[PDB]
Amino acid sequence: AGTINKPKKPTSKRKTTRLRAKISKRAAEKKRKERKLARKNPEWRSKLKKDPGIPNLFPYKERLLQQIEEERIRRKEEL
Amino acid sequence: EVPKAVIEPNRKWFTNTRVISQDTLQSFREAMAEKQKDPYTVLLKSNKLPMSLIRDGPKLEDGLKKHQAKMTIEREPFSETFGPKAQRKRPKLSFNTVDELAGYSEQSLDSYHARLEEKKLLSVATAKEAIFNKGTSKRIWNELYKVIDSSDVILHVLDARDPLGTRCR
Amino acid sequence: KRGAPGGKLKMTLGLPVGAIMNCADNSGARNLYIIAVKGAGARLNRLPAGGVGDMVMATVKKGKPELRKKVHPAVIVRQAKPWKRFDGVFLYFEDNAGVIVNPKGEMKGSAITGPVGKEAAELWPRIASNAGVVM
Amino acid sequence: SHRKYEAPRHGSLAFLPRKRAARHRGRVKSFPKDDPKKPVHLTAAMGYKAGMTTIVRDLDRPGAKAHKKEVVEAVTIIDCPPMVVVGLVGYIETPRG
Amino acid sequence: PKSKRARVYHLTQVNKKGREAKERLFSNIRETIPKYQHCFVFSVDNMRNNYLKDVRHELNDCRIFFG
Amino acid sequence: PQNEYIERHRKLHGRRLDAEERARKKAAREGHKNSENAQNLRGLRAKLYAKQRHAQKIQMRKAIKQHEERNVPSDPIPSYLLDRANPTTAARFSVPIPKVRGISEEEMFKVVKTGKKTHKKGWKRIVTKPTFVGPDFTRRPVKYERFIRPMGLRYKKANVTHPTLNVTVQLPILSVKKNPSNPLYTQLGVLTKGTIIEVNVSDLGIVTASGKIAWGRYAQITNNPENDGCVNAVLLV
Amino acid sequence: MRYIHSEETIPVPENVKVSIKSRLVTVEGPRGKLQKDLSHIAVNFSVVKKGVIGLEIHHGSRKDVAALRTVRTIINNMIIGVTKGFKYKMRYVYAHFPINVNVEKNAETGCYEVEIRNFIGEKIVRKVVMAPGVEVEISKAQKDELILSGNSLEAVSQSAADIQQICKVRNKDIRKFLDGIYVSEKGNIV
Amino acid sequence: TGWKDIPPVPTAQEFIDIVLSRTQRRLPTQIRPGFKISRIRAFYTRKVKFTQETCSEKFGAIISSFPVLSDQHPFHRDLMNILYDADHFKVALGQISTAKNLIETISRDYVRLLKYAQSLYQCKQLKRAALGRMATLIKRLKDPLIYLDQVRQHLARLPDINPTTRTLLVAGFPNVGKSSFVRSVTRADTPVEPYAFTTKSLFVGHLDYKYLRYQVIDTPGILDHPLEEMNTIEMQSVTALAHLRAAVLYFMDI
RNA sequence: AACGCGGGGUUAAGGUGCCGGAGUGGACGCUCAUCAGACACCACAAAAGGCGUUAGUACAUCUUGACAGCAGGACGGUGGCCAUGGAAGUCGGAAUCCGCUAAGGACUGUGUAACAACUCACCUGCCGAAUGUACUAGCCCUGAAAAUGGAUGGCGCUCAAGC
RNA sequence: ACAGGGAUGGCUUGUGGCGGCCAAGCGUUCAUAGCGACGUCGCUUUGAUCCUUCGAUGUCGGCUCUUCCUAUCAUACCGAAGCAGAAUUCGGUAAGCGUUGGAUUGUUCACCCACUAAUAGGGAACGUGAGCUGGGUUUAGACCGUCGUGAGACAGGUUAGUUUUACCCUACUGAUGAACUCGUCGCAAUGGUAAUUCAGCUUAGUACGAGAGGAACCGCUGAUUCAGAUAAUUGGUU
Ligand SMILES: [Mg+2]
């Protein structure tokens, strides 16, 4: 485009009080409406979230798994 | 004031409002075939009837010609007829033998010359004046349809010196 | 090719749109009523106008009835508004007159009554061939 | 709302303000660009307008319709008695002109 | 790295071989070792080598590996 | 020239000497050009470009999945119905839309002003929604026509869907049974959303248990006809 | 992620003298001398070995590390230009109107001038002035072929590009009108 | 004269994009809810009417540009049947005219409704309904538009054959020398090759004999079987032999 | 944060490049915008489009040689079947197997009237060590604009005076 | 007649609604439900017919004149298309420069006609509103139609009919001017800025083409619209 040699009317970054107030009211209304759809949400939600686990690039994941298995064996022996 | 626009549950919404028997339909079909036109009788209140089951069907040639185009396209798609992927090899001919082709060419040439003579028998010209468009205005025809919509009896007035000329079919 | 001829020097245009000029050929028309001028530019409120040697579009107001329902091309061959040639001569004819042609410039009639202008005769060779007097 | 019929503007903005000139003698705003390879010459002169008259010119202009013909043209006569040179001004070049 | 040469996916039948080809070559050589009296090593350097098909056809009682 | 003259010219004289190299280089620059178009276009052209690119990416992914999975009717119908285009085919007597947005009388009717003075009379009301006037309809005279149902808003037919048979047919409207907002709206025959209308179902071929032909049933309007320009209804079956 | 150290190397032939000061590279060989200012790119030049020029960047981003490859290719092409030279062969082909190419050498400016006449019968004479250091000849071995040789690859290729761009067919079908001057071969003089 | 002056026939999606871009860009697009309802109605009415007028102009150009098969000389009419299947040809053009008429009906209906619309939202929904229904109607024309564009290009590249002038029409089996004769007597660029059916179309050249223009028509070869077994390539020659009053030069290779 | 008139001290919210009192303050990063951003959250707006730039996650290949190239191979039944004036992998419809294999589709494209010829999938040799794919998170660009000349309050700011 | 009170908006733009199906994904994996882009499918004349025009509560104009926007009709340049040539079609950058003359009021005055390179669309009013002048439009006179017993009102139709500044401030266009002695010759910050389009000769009946047809660069000559002057000549003016 010929933007450099012939720029157009600038897009003002100066806000107006009316628009700021309207945007604040709309944001509050959206937050309340989202709370309302959340309290009447019929979508299924799991009791326990899917836990990501241990990263592979962690260098001591193998000994941490050894610790987990040892803790399970100790708990089974105690119980 | 904004009302509560609610529809109650009712068994009447799921039933048939109007039913008709086959004997009644056949009697109505016989009446439909037997009916004639009398100018000295007028229609006062139409009977609510299932006319699609009572009036006769379309004619044979009409029923075929309304579906000839769709039938030809279903038989041969546009892409198989002409184009880069076309598979059409033998054309469709109205003749079968060489003698029939010669006779067909003779009749085709005669008909083409007849059409050319008819068209010949039938500096640019000036535009038609807008005075001759009078009586065809959208405002005038809005008025006409308003009067028709509001009237029960319509008197169509004819000049006695040119009745079919002034008649509005 | 549009009807405006090339190589024409500027002259005074004496015949605007709405002028009635005489018909100088034996096509059957007696007068030509100018409705448009070929090569006329665009200007607000300005009437298109033509001079000697210009092609205009005209309707026939008096003449044979077959000519009355068409828009004919015509070439102006005489004008009464005085104009100057390049040799310094200001001149005018005693009437405004034109001849009916086709878009390619050939005449509809077969003879021209009265003289024609040098501009018209030089721009249109058929008018030059059918002109008895060139002034 | 928009102007329905377009028309070009009356007059040119390149000649504003339409005021009286600040001097009666015309001012040479620009001189020809100096080339040091050319011989020395004066770039201007003065005269007094006497009036106008008419000529007949024998025209040699190939391509024109009036080629090899006589044309009548208007001309202007400027009376030019010789000028007298009485001075010399030198100009240096500065970042302000 | 957002700027990246886009890899073309091949919409053709044959896929890459992988380690299964290597294991199959190993098994074929190790099962053809005990069946033959001699094993020759041959070289074809800077050659088009499409005549090894004719060599294989002519020596039908032998086994040639060119992996 | 005649027939395939450019192809014959290519066969006899070739092409321009740099044509292959120019085509190869342009295809090679297409990646930079596509990213430049994605980052530098503006407005509606950019939006249409982005939607088109989204579509091509989806289709390419679908083709990729098909090539991955290369190496791996529903209802019983008779033989004469095989290979034809058959429909997919998927107490409390409640309608599918039991509640809609109620229409106030100020929204329903506008005031038609009469008189030559500056102060006008305001008794005439014009219906601003589609209506059904029924058969044998003659308009009231203007001196006594309080309610005006304009001719350009009167409807006679509707696109009616049978939920069981999964077929949409254009049927004639027989009557208006119940507009949910107002009995006056029912009497004026206003076709709005949630309205129960009576439709002629002769084209659907419905036969009752006793063998009689059912040619009138109830449908509910499921769209907004004043915004839509048409009436869409669902049969109450 | 900033890379601590990155290095490139440029081997130098035995008959080539390379001098770098303030990132201004001067390469002289049997065919002459080429010069190029590379001060727009931050780089440490060094002599890592006899006959090897080392290029280093310290604490640089991936883009800064990548610019060294461009610098390497540029200096290598300068070395190739002063050692073997660069030669672009162009061919002009025509259908009906024979293209007339005249090559002169301007004594005032020292540059070559190529004049193209009768391109698709046009009456205009197209004139292209070569970059300095580019020599243009009409080949006698082959038909309708120009040969542009030089030490600067950029100059030779841009001159060939100028000759290709000036003979452009406009408002015609290019499937039918094949006329033009095209770069037919690229290589070295030696 | 020929048929090179048919304007190009766009596809369905190209047609939609062209029409909607004209509506977007040749008309103002900014309307405000605070304006008068008559102003808003006029804005949306202008959008609908202009979209219909663009559609009608393009459809009318397509319809009036293509040849009318009833008005042709019988040679041209039967040749266009042989090349393009007159049934498919007429069906495609009839669908184009039907879509044009339906678009005009939709425009009239939605202009009539926009007369009574009461808000910018309702006017906007009616405008979108009108334009969407026009888009659906154009989208239903995908196969006829492709077929008509192919037919247009072939018709533009057809030779110009005057059926009522002096003409020498060359016929026979393949590989007998028809193209060699036509090349030797005319300036036509018809290929001469040793394989059968080198010439698959009608070629025409011209010559002068005693200051008169003669046209020479080279045809594809004909085999020895009845007419119902001939393909379109041989039926071009058969139609030329049947409908052109010519001097037939039947070539045999002995 | 609440109020009589005054002096001294200290703060809150907000600020400390200049206008302007107070830091061109310190540390670690990120970002270059053809009108960035600096008081955003709402809308435009989507599971949106980016061969912009970084940080991650998962899966996969790799000295038994990966990813990129270059040099070569890319074969036999077979011109598979039907169809076509012609149709040999490459106008179509349907099948899509075997041999030789290191590997090579009853073929990915260019090409021929049909062949031929070239090219791709795949394989080998040369080379030499890390890569590929998809998602996630940041910041950047696009994600729609009219109409007098103008606005992060202004100058202006780019290892910031932005985040 | 009197006393008073008044005169939706970071909106919009290019792609319909309803009903079903499919669906990458989101969720769910003690329930296998629910959301879901991309799509798709149903309803909404063999180039026809012309014997189906479907309601003013909402009001627009014209003249003169300046400027801006680009959402480009023409002019400039460019990409693609069986784009041979010619004529074009689609698209891109571009608002520098233009974008006309008429007919029709038994009417939403919108459609026709011609010229032309082309006859592009908007804003600055219509998100109420003192330039001039026609229509919505409506004080008092008058008539017909509809309604009412009537005064009268209206579904309506017609005719005739009073607002009449500027010398003020600012703005704008021009004209003088104190202070620095008077004058002559100068410079140039800053502000404004200007040209536009067609045609003809040549190239050339050439390239290209089966034919019909048929260019362009260089060169040359006029004309359109605009602008700035001038009065030798010709008209007008006394
Ligand atoms: Mg042959």
Short mmCIF file of C-alpha atoms and ligand atoms in Angstrom, two decimals, chain H residues 175 193-195 198, ligand 1:
data_model
loop_
_atom_site.label_atom_id
_atom_site.label_comp_id
_atom_site.label_asym_id
_atom_site.label_seq_id
_atom_site.Cartn_x
_atom_site.Cartn_y
_atom_site.Cartn_z
CA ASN H 175 -4.77 -41.50 -44.40
CA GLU H 193 0.48 -37.21 -40.24
CA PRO H 194 0.58 -40.92 -41.13
CA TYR H 195 -1.80 -42.09 -38.37
CA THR H 198 -4.99 -36.84 -37.46
MG MG K 1 -3.68 -38.97 -41.35
#
